[PDB]
């Protein structure tokens, strides 16, 4: 039973570390995705102003 | 006849084009608002996740 | 030791469930970002085409 308990402790330590790394990676990927979305919408606003002046021609 | 047609079409098409761009711009605005709302709720979700991690650390310490 | 082993197995199973859920979450976020990034790249290439069309005048 001591061997089994030590095996379980290592298994969960591994799974917990995996949990923390996956959550950090998820947070980072969300940050990247929505920053990129913001950049896309910003260049969209640039196109909006550009078309407005082009109509103003 | 041809020239008058060309001006008529150019004017009415220009008006349609401006309306179409405004429709795209308003849709983009709605997406921008939803984007900010999602930024705040992702912040809240990360707060909930760190609190859940703290609770899990307490559970790990208790045994 | 039997009680401790049972507790350890329960927490290890919890952590396994957690890592699985996080793996699905990251896979979904990655797919959403791939689609958005492809959209952005298409927007950029079309903008380059537009720029050459205006320079063609």
UniProtKB/Swiss-Prot annotation, chains A, C:
> Which domain of life, per UniProt?
Eukaryota
Q: Where in the cell is it found?
A: Cytoplasm, Cytoskeleton
**Annotated S-S bridges:** none
Could you say which residues form the signal peptide? none
**Expression across tissues:** Detected in primary breast cancer tissues but undetectable in normal breast tissues in Sudanese patients. Isoform 1 is expressed in adult and fetal skeletal muscle and cardiac tissues, with higher expression levels in the cardiac tissues. Isoform 10 is expressed in adult and fetal cardiac tissues, but not in skeletal muscle.
The protein's PTM annotation reads: Phosphorylated at Ser-56 by DAPK1 in response to oxidative stress and this phosphorylation enhances stress fiber formation in endothelial cells.
Membrane-spanning ranges: none
Q: Which residues carry this modification: Phosphoserine?
A: 25, 44, 56
Outcome recorded upon mutating residue 56 to A = Loss of phosphorylation and decreased formation of actin stress fibers
Residue numbers carrying Phosphotyrosine: 34
Q: What is the similarity comment for this entry?
A: Belongs to the tropomyosin family.
**Self-association state and partner proteins as the record states:** Homodimer. Heterodimer of an alpha (TPM1, TPM3 or TPM4) and a beta (TPM2) chain. Interacts with HRG (via the HRR domain); the interaction contributes to the antiangiogenic properties of the histidine/proline-rich region (HRR) of HRG. Interacts (via N-terminus) with LMOD2 (via N-terminus) and TMOD1 (via N-terminus).
Q: What is known of its domains?
A: The molecule is in a coiled coil structure that is formed by 2 polypeptide chains. The sequence exhibits a prominent seven-residues periodicity.
Q: What does this protein do?
A: Binds to actin filaments in muscle and non-muscle cells. Plays a central role, in association with the troponin complex, in the calcium dependent regulation of vertebrate striated muscle contraction. Smooth muscle contraction is regulated by interaction with caldesmon. In non-muscle cells is implicated in stabilizing cytoskeleton actin filaments.
Pathological condition linked to this protein in its record = Cardiomyopathy, familial hypertrophic, 3: A hereditary heart disorder characterized by ventricular hypertrophy, which is usually asymmetric and often involves the interventricular septum. The symptoms include dyspnea, syncope, collapse, palpitations, and chest pain. They can be readily provoked by exercise. The disorder has inter- and intrafamilial variability ranging from benign to malignant forms with high risk of cardiac failure and sudden cardiac death.
Its recorded name reads Tropomyosin alpha-1 chain
Query: Organism, per UniProt?
Result: Homo sapiens (Human)
What is the name of the gene encoding this protein?
A: TPM1
UniProtKB/Swiss-Prot annotation, chain B:
In the UniProt record, the gene name given for this protein reads TNNT2
**Keywords, A to Z?**
Acetylation, Cardiomyopathy, Disease variant, Muscle protein, Phosphoprotein
Name the residue ranges with Basic and acidic residues bias: 22-63
Disorder cited: Cardiomyopathy, familial hypertrophic, 2: A hereditary heart disorder characterized by ventricular hypertrophy, which is usually asymmetric and often involves the interventricular septum. The symptoms include dyspnea, syncope, collapse, palpitations, and chest pain. They can be readily provoked by exercise. The disorder has inter- and intrafamilial variability ranging from benign to malignant forms with high risk of cardiac failure and sudden cardiac death. Cardiomyopathy, dilated, 1D: A disorder characterized by ventricular dilation and impaired systolic function, resulting in congestive heart failure and arrhythmia. Patients are at risk of premature death.
Q: Which domain of life is it from?
A: Eukaryota
Q: Is the keyword Transport in the record?
A: no
UniProt function note: Troponin T is the tropomyosin-binding subunit of troponin, the thin filament regulatory complex which confers calcium-sensitivity to striated muscle actomyosin ATPase activity.
Q: What is this protein called?
A: Troponin T, cardiac muscle
Which tissue types show expression of this protein? Answer: Heart. The fetal heart shows a greater expression in the atrium than in the ventricle, while the adult heart shows a greater expression in the ventricle than in the atrium. Isoform 6 predominates in normal adult heart. Isoforms 1, 7 and 8 are expressed in fetal heart. Isoform 7 is also expressed in failing adult heart.
Which part of the entire protein is covered? 99 to 161 of 298
Which organism does this sequence originate in?
Homo sapiens (Human)
Q: Can you cite an annotated GO cellular component?
A: striated muscle thin filament
User: Quick one: a GO biological-process term for this protein?
Assistant: regulation of heart contraction
Concerning its family, UniProt says:
Belongs to the troponin T family.
Gene Ontology terms for molecular function: actin binding; identical protein binding; tropomyosin binding; troponin C binding; troponin I binding
């Amino acid at each position: 039973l001591s061997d089994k308990l030590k095996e379980a402790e290592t298994r969960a330590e591994f799974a917990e570390r995996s949990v923390t790394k996956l959550e950090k990676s998820i947070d980072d990927l969300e940050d990247e995705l929505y920053a990129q979305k913001l950049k896309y919408k910003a260049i969209s606003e640039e196109l909006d102003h550009a078309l407005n002046d082009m109509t103003s021609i | 006849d041809i020239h008058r047609k060309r001006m008529e079409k150019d004017l009415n098409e220009l008006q349609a084009l401006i309306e179409a761009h405004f429709e795209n711009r308003k849709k983009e605005e709605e997406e921008l608002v939803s984007l900010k709302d999602r930024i705040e709720r992702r912040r809240a979700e990360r707060a909930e996740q760190q609190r859940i991690r703290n609770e899990r650390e307490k559970e790990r310490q208790n045994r």
